[PDB]
Design a protein around this ligand. Structure first.
Ligand SMILES: CC(C)(C(=O)Nc1ccc(-c2cncc(C(F)(F)F)n2)cn1)c1csc(NS(=O)(=O)C2CC2)n1
Ligand SMILES: CC(C)(C(=O)Nc1ccc(-c2cncc(C(F)(F)F)n2)cn1)c1csc(NS(=O)(=O)C2CC2)n1
Ligand SMILES: CC(C)(C(=O)Nc1ccc(-c2cncc(C(F)(F)F)n2)cn1)c1csc(NS(=O)(=O)C2CC2)n1
Ligand SMILES: O=c1ccn([C@@H]2O[C@H](COP(=O)(O)OP(=O)(O)OP(=O)(O)O)[C@@H](O)[C@H]2O)c(=O)[nH]1
Ligand SMILES: O=c1ccn([C@@H]2O[C@H](COP(=O)(O)OP(=O)(O)OP(=O)(O)O)[C@@H](O)[C@H]2O)c(=O)[nH]1
Ligand SMILES: O=c1ccn([C@@H]2O[C@H](COP(=O)(O)OP(=O)(O)OP(=O)(O)O)[C@@H](O)[C@H]2O)c(=O)[nH]1
Ligand SMILES: NC(=O)CC[C@H](N)C(=O)O
Ligand SMILES: NC(=O)CC[C@H](N)C(=O)O
Ligand SMILES: NC(=O)CC[C@H](N)C(=O)O
Ligand SMILES: [Mg+2]
Ligand SMILES: [Mg+2]
Ligand SMILES: [Mg+2]
Lengths: 533, 533, 533
């Protein structure tokens, strides 16, 4: 079992998780079984507590683990499905050591960061690397470990100290370190300034790790002079200095790393035994005709959602132009306070070829979602409602077709006489992979799902369609195995108007877009009726 | 005597010397006498040894000190003239302590960095601050000390350790620290990333200095959220967090700092007792008509030269478009190897309204300077030759008017039968402020110099017009006090064709452009004959 | 050429130079040619400027280099004779780079600590290691480099950074690092506290060197538990953790290191191709009868002097008890101010079996030296005067035999009518190895020097016997080659009363004591008249 530690230098956000995922897909293209671990240096046990503006888009695993979006990048670059504990955190590891101490497992010895926390990190990394997360049950050959944050943060110090030991616990042929840095090119200077990379490598070596690769996040490509200054002051070979510059599509980043020789490096360095990504890149860069989706949302918070639309767009062979609409601008109160916000949002929503109402929590902007769904019903615009979008598609059909004008969920208005979507916990949240049964053949969604009698999809919600009001409601084509819970709704006498109670986007891959996002893209270009035919 | 230490964070080149100079001109606008010290953490005693690609444009002081371009920024933002030792270096300070040790002045004690080098830095800073560098002999009230490099470099550590002591030697009301940092805004992220500023302030506090001001070099203005994150993690008041964003003209940087409240801060913080810069900025931003100068040079290396043209441009009320021409592209051999380089250079040189041949050293590109001067003579283009440009204007007039086709300097071709410019050392280099006498009234240069019988200008050259060949040569209107050395040449029967043996640009200020650069700008827009009239 | 860097941890003074010398004599016992370099992180060029209380006993090399006492430990543990530049300092290396910069050798580039000073250190270390300092002209196989100071001092950082590069310039088989630390055992705690060693190794690894050996300066031997805690937290093998505890004699320190396995370690670790020290130790520890020497001195400052007496003592097979007498206590003014100091000093001087007046500078205590020599003449006590002791033996014979009661040197009393020892510079100081000729056979000193017609000895003085007054003066048996300078004086009609103008102690080795120190030891036990017979 080989390990690659990806570490971040000057700043976060510089594509380190894309580099980690690209290194993984490169090694998978070498025929290796590859797993991945994200370390997030935060005290939070799971991302499920986060407001989607900080560590945006909590990605939901099969087991119900609410984790960082980087775990979703791993599942998209590599055909793996991960477990909760592939997201390591200081909360998870300190709680482990604390509970272990309270049980007496440390045998009356003083517990402390070195060794006991640094051992716990190594134990965890070894354990999770041996788990066959891959699409078939084969034991992984390499684990790409991404350390979040930046080096020399007080939060990252335990993990770097653990990896400093780890490279002597496993042999050097089993441990590589990549340092992903920034080389800024200021307006103030015109030069590509390597100084912060040099200081960050110096800092990392002060913590006892020496970069085997220095991967520079550049905007423009590195000059030779700057690369030789990096090689010099980072005390490493020129071949081991890489530029990841700005590129047109995500699909080029493995190819850029391939060109830069990292594959050949890893093969020799770790003693180890992608033409689709050329194709997808070249295909992307020659898309002329454009679809347009209105994303009517509250909240990067739509990372998986956007990616699922781009997969779908590339599959139908169109560009995508996503009309990001703040749902709080489609509310009639924004017509009072800011008529410029109100009319620009409705220009965007009307010019859109279809509309997507994504999931979320809280009242704020829900009435703007309900008005965006009303537009999409009555003007026959292709509609996808995801999680909350299904719940509010049942509220909108209740208000403006059934005439139950009071109707809402018990999340927002528990005082309502028509609680058409109700708090319905698992006898907790309906969270992770559940099986949905198709209750019929009469579904376009069933046809898009390949005419299977069931599907299994990742859920993350507390509320469901009320089974009393269901009798008056809007064909609930997908149900749970108990028949208790409605999980797909499809409206009769519309081109495509779907609510799904799960999150389709978490299972979208470039090679296989999720069928409701594909159906939305197909319908909003009029190709769905050809596809189903 | 008050001290302000300006320190650099993430990178160099982020306008720290402009910030230091702006802080100085702000305090001078408060009516204070202000001096400045640049510390360059390099082992070099003086910049006179540098190739102009590294620490480009060696600025020459009155005393003959060859120093960094930042000393020239101090002389341009503040009407001061500095001494050699206002450029402090590790070479100057270690050589001081070493020579002092060899003389036994440390009384048989072991000399070491702390205290003896850190004392020497403090001694130097106090001594040079008491020197009246200002336009009248009044003792300075504040010294702006700029520390070059970045904090936590092994070179900068002695100086930061010295300043850590200094703030307890002089009282806190006599010592302020400004930290000039970078807040990058990546294409990869869209966010303004404060992390490297936080780490740099943390690093600086590890070296025992706490930022009184954190000045963020931004591209775009700081968001409130980012400023509050800086104030938090740098543990300082929001009012003490400043953004210096990108602005149109240099003239706005004091005004931006003024708006950001730093003047009011310094006045209270140091217990101390610019409308022209509004004017110059607004004047600059509304210039419509453009002059164009061909800068036919070898080598930022033309920093003072460019600034002198921009002063002149703003004074005549035109824009400037500088046609940077690599002199090595005007050589006929570049017509052989790269005819695209050769013709683009001659398009630039012919479309130019006048030509400037700046100073320099070595053969490389001199034949391209000689061909650019030949163009400027015979096509009656306004010409300024500076230092080497005068020497080569005497070579060109010798080759193509006198027919001495062999002619060159003894620097390039010592074997020549017509050594028309010869190695003529000071009985060393002719370096620093010398007095030139005007040998006549018949000079446009004398009229531009206000009809004075002499001028005093900063020289930096080893070679001079041969007094033998002078008799055959091209009116040498300016001579030294000995009559040994020709120091201005002016050609008869041309609009404006001047060689000066000194560097006029080192004495250019926004409020007073140097007369040959002004005369070139005036002549290349046809206004000179009105100005002299 | 192999390198061993010895580095110091918690404090200086913890026997690091004895460890370095012991490692050298171990490798020399393996049949290797071994050289040594001391790095002193101080700004001083040479130790010749020091007051003997700081870096006490300036050791004088053949070339006239005045260096630290550790260079003398190298010459005593290994039969080598060193050059000036085997003492490296920051003064020597910064002056090198500065002078090299002023000559333009750095080609207009910015000189800075990394690379240019760190390169200069590596250049120096390589150059001085190739010099055959050994007793025959064979090129060294290993250089033991001792870094003075402690790790993580701002002074030591350039050298550790140089060695961090050096281990990748030469291969790992050519570079070993030993870390000599302290393990304190407080009265407050009873435990041996490894924490400062762990922190010092952590600090050293932050500077990029990892201990190949951790040598603990212990008082008492390490416990197993403490050694295993060191091995753990210093992340190194138990076999690579060594205790150098307190031992009876210096002769045991190589044997202790041998027992601890370091020889076997170095042989494998550096891929390389002492029974006298058992003997000398066992011989020392069974010495019963004692000689006693009065050391009547001003000033560790007598390190070489003490060692030369101990060599002599071990050779005659007696113990030595050195009566350290502050010469300022034998002055009659101390009878006025402190009669307890005055009488204790004269009890010590009278109970002594012989007296040694060592070299020194300045008036202070010279009248106490003159009174100690007066005692030794007239009471027929065996006397050795070294350098200043010869000069003052000519002053004392002038005052109290010739009756020139005014007599002194021109150093102390230039106004004197009998300047019997005069300032006589080299047409500078008479410094380093000079040849002395014996002007006769009638000398006990010539017999002790093996009946050679000349000797060559290390001098360090500015003053000499006046050749005018010489005619009235006390047989000057040793002269320089010019006959200008008297260099041995021997008094007729006394058991043994010798002045030497050189320093015999710098050439004393355990296997060969210097003959005047041996003659003093022999005479003060009455064995000299048997030895010469
Ligand atoms: C949104 C879109 C269209 C895309 O091309 N985005 C894009 C483009 C360029 C970069 C980029 C540019 N330079 C440097 C770096 C880095 F490497 F340094 F970070 N990145 C990042 N993201 C897309 C479709 S599918 C997807 N992502 S995905 O579903 O995970 C799939 C891969 C498995 N994104
Ligand atoms: C060349 C030109 C026309 C100029 O406007 N340049 C320019 C413009 C903007 C900035 C700038 C933008 N944002 C931020 C910062 C910083 F503060 F963060 F660095 N700077 C820097 N330089 C000029 C004329 S005169 C001169 N300079 S000068 O002769 O010394 C005189 C002042 C005394 N330059
Ligand atoms: C003065 C005397 C009698 C002596 O035994 N001293 C003594 C004794 C023990 C230690 C000692 C105890 N524990 C630990 C460590 C260390 F290793 F950790 F430092 N040292 C140090 N010095 C002596 C004679 S000859 C000489 N020295 S010498 O001429 O250079 C010759 C060797 C070539 N000294
Ligand atoms: O203002 C000054 C004065 C002196 N120096 C000194 O000159 C050296 C120049 O070094 P830089 O700071 O330019 O760093 P670099 O070349 O290693 O990296 P980038 O430019 O690519 O970011 C520094 O390390 C410092 O010792 C300055 O950088 N700037
Ligand atoms: O990938 C991950 C995982 C975890 N974390 C953790 O979350 C914290 C988020 O902090 P950031 O790294 O975003 O830093 P910041 O907000 O102080 O500064 P800028 O964004 O303006 O540059 C970090 O300090 C680290 O502890 C990440 O940053 N990224
Ligand atoms: O007062 C306290 C409280 C807590 N601790 C904690 O317990 C740990 C005990 O560790 P020590 O400080 O005893 O260090 P050590 O055993 O590594 O080394 P020596 O004793 O040989 O010097 C420390 O590292 C700290 O985390 C104390 O040491 N002391
Ligand atoms: N995942 C979501 O979109 C949440 C929807 C809704 N708030 C619920 O809890 O069911
Ligand atoms: N300052 C310059 O332009 C130098 C010109 C020429 N090389 C000289 O030494 O005179
Ligand atoms: N080495 C010494 O003892 C110095 C003796 C005397 N001061 C001289 O200079 O000669
Ligand atoms: Mg640089
Ligand atoms: Mg952040
Ligand atoms: Mg302990």
């Amino acid at each position: 079992m080989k390990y690659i530690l990806v570490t971040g230098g000057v700043i976060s956000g510089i594509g380190k998780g894309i580099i980690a995922s690209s290194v993984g897909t490169i090694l998978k293209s070498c025929g290796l079984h590859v797993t991945s671990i994200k370390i997030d240096p935060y005290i939070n046990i799971d991302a499920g507590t986060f407001s989607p503006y900080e560590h945006g888009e909590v990605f939901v695993l099969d087991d119900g683990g609410e984790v960082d979006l980087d775990l979703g990048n791993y599942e998209r670059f590599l055909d793996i499905r991960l477990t909760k504990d592939n997201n390591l955190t200081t909360g998870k590891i300190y709680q482990y050591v604390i509970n272990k101490e309270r049980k007496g497992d440390y045998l009356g010895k003083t517990v402390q960061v070195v060794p006991h926390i640094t051992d716990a990190i190594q134990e965890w990394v070894m354990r999770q690397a041996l788990i066959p997360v891959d699409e078939d049950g084969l034991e992984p050959q390499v684990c790409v470990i991404e350390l979040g944050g930046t080096v020399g943060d007080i939060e990252s110090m335990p993990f770097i100290e653990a990896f400093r030991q780890f490279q002597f616990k496993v042999k050097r042929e089993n441990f590589c370190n990549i340092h992903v840095s920034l080389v800024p090119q200021p307006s103030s200077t015109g030069e590509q300034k390597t100084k912060p990379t040099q200081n960050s490598v110096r800092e990392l070596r002060g913590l006892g790790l020496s970069p085997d690769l220095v991967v520079c996040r550049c905007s423009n490509p590195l000059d030779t002079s700057v690369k030789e200054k990096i090689s010099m002051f980072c005390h490493v070979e020129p071949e081991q200095v890489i530029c990841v510059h700005d590129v047109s599509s995500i699909y080029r980043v493995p190819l850029l790393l391939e060109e830069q020789g990292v594959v050949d490096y890893f093969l020799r360095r770790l003693d180890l035994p992608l033409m689709k990504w050329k194709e997808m890149a070249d295909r992307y860069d020659r898309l002329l005709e454009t679809c347009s989706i209105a994303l009517v949302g509250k909240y990067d918070s739509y990372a998986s959602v956007i990616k699922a639309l781009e997969h779908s767009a590339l599959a139908i062979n169109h560009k995508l132009e996503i009309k990001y609409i703040d749902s709080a601008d489609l509310e009639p109160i924004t017509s009072q306070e800011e008529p410029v916000r109100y009319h620009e949002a409705w220009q965007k929503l009307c010019s859109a070829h279809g509309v997507l109402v994504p999931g979320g929590f809280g009242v704020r902007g829900t009435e703007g979602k309900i008005q965006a769904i009303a537009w999409a019903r009555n003007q026959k615009k292709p509609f996808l409602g995801v999680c909350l979008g299904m719940q509010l598609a049942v509220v909108e059909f209740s208000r403006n077709v059934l005439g139950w004008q009071d109707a809402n969920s018990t999340e927002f208005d528990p005082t309502t006489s028509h609680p058409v979507v109700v708090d319905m916990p698992e006898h907790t949240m309906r969270l992770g992979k559940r099986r949905t049964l198709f209750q019929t053949k009469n579904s376009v969604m069933r046809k898009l799902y390949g005419d299977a009698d069931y599907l299994e999809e990742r859920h993350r919600h507390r509320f469901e369609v009320n089974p009393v009001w269901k009798k008056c409601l809007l064909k609930f084509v997908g149900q749970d195995v108990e028949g208790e819970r409605m999980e797909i709704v499809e409206l009769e006498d519309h081109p495509f108007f779907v609510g799904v109670q799960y999150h389709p986007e978490f299972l979208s891959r470039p090679i296989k877009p999720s069928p409701p996002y594909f159906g939305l893209l197909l319908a909003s270009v009029g190709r769905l009726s050809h596809y189903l035919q």
